Amino acid sequence: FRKMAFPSGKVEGCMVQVTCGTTTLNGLWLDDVVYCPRHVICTSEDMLNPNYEDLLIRKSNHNFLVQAGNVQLRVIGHSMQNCVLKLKVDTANPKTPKYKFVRIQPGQTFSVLACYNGSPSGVYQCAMRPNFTIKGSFLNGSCGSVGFNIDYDCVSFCYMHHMELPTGVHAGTDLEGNFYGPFVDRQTAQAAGTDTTITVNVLAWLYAAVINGDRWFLNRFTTTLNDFNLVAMKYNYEPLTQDHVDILGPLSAQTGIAVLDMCASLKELLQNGMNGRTILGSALLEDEFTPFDVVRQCS
Amino acid sequence: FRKMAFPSGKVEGCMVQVTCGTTTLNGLWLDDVVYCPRHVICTSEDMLNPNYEDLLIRKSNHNFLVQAGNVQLRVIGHSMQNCVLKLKVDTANPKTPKYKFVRIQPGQTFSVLACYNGSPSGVYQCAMRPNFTIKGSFLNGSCGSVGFNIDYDCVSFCYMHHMELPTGVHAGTDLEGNFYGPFVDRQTAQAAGTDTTITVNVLAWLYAAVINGDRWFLNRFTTTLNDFNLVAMKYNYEPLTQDHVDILGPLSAQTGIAVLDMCASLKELLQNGMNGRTILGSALLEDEFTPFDVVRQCSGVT
């Protein structure tokens, strides 16, 4: 049972490089617009405390160097929407897929196509943490990389990368430029709220483990939804809602293990630990598979 | 840090479906040839003791349905190379990347583009285990899915998927149709040999720990390669080759820690416990990161 990302071809065809002065990052080229983080307009000193409206009014179209592969795209207009820059170019992207911009909820997962200098480097799965950070793998030059999901032929962009926090987790925006969480695109020390574990994802992962024949954690204890949530909150786990119980339905039907019975198993794992044992090869409870991810891969 | 698949766009542009009768799997369309597992020509009941030579002599070009989506590609030639069928088609794939066919070593990693009916569904990183199985995620209809690496612009194809073993692990061929390991494309009882830990990959992960400042496990000892190999086998670890010592070279130089000094530190971790301590946030030693995976992820190769 592997973390599986969506195939990245439809997004690779949209990645371009954007440069102002000596700052380079990636942009997303859809039709005749390039989207990219607005701090590409910042000098290093600017990043320390940027007034973005002041910085942008002092820029001209020709200050923006956009390159798709080797070919420069001429910028013929620009505007700012929250923390993203929209650069109008004189060329439409022939590889533009069917797409939408979405704002995802904490606990939901998405694929990240990490790019440098407008070129794709790697693909992997993430989840929006409850504290609105993401545990990514991003280096210098990765800003403008996007997170996405794919449904039929339609790409749902949900994330664009802006920054790394001092703990090593990452922060970014939706494609309307609004940050996930209480962060700002300024180079200054920023902490996140206390993170919590995505409970419904842990349960779905436990179902995946049972589907693969790893059952040592199951028990015959019973629990009400409320009593499970009390223990969950005590251990910094997110509350389980009845809709969460409902979306776990298909997995409970396939395994013959009632959702609340899987809650009883998890509750004992939280109170006793995993001893020295593993689940699906993991020494920790994994919470970045949604119920949909598990069903998608195990059925 | 995490496992990272290569961008799959170059391979996605090469996936097609191949059907004989009601048996459909995936094929790889490069230039004017489609490569796919030869058991597509098997009826459900002939997979028990298939005579592939006699099944293929019954087939003509017009029995093969090759589709890029719903667009049919005309087959103009067919031949069998080991366990792979090569179907010549009348159209050269305009999306053919620069490519090569490679046969990889146990321990080497690769991305897998899992496909169904020629439609890509997901991408993930896999390692070839020392027992020549891979711990994949393959369902019915995934055969013909390929595994690959990308270096600059060139796709090295190294795996094509054929079968699942009783323990839920998977087996397949290189793109010349030669199985990895002692497996055969027959629906009979087969079993993976007992697996071992990929020592060169564990060492790469230790180097990655050191690069990140996590170095409590460095000791003041060294060892010889031969003594380390003999001890490692006692813990079900693979022995190191001279090539293994050399591909750790870049990480040894970056950290300043000699390969054999890192071998002695790992030997201590094997003989003693981890003392309830962690390495890169893990109580387990990771063995599915090659030296190349460490470099490319730690320095962001495109």
UniProtKB/Swiss-Prot annotation, chain A:
Function recorded in the entry: Cleaves the C-terminus of replicase polyprotein at 11 sites. Recognizes substrates containing the core sequence [ILMVF]-Q-|-[SGACN]. Cleaves and inactivates human TRMT1, preventing tRNA guanine(26)-dimethylation of tRNAs. May cleave human NLRP1 in lung epithelial cells, thereby activating the NLRP1 inflammasome pathway. May cleave human GSDMD, triggering alternative GSDME-mediated epithelial cell death upon activation of the NLRP1 inflammasome, which may enhance the release interleukins 1B, 6, 16 and 18. Also able to bind an ADP-ribose-1''-phosphate (ADRP).
Active site: 39 (for 3cl-pro activity), 143 (nucleophile)
Ranges of the Cytoplasmic topological domain: 1-299
Effect upon mutating residue 187 to A: Does not affect ability to cleave and inactivate human TRMT1
Outcome following mutation: residue 203 to V: In strain: Zeta/P.2
The reaction(s) this protein catalyses: TSAVLQ-|-SGFRK-NH2 and SGVTFQ-|-GKFKK the two peptides corresponding to the two self-cleavage sites of the SARS 3C-like proteinase are the two most reactive peptide substrates. The enzyme exhibits a strong preference for substrates containing Gln at P1 position and Leu at P2 position
Subcellular locations according to the entry: Host cytoplasm; Host Golgi apparatus; Host nucleus
Superkingdom as given in the UniProt entry: Viruses
Protein name, entry field: 3C-like proteinase nsp5
Full-length numbering of the shown residues: 3266 to 3564 of 7096
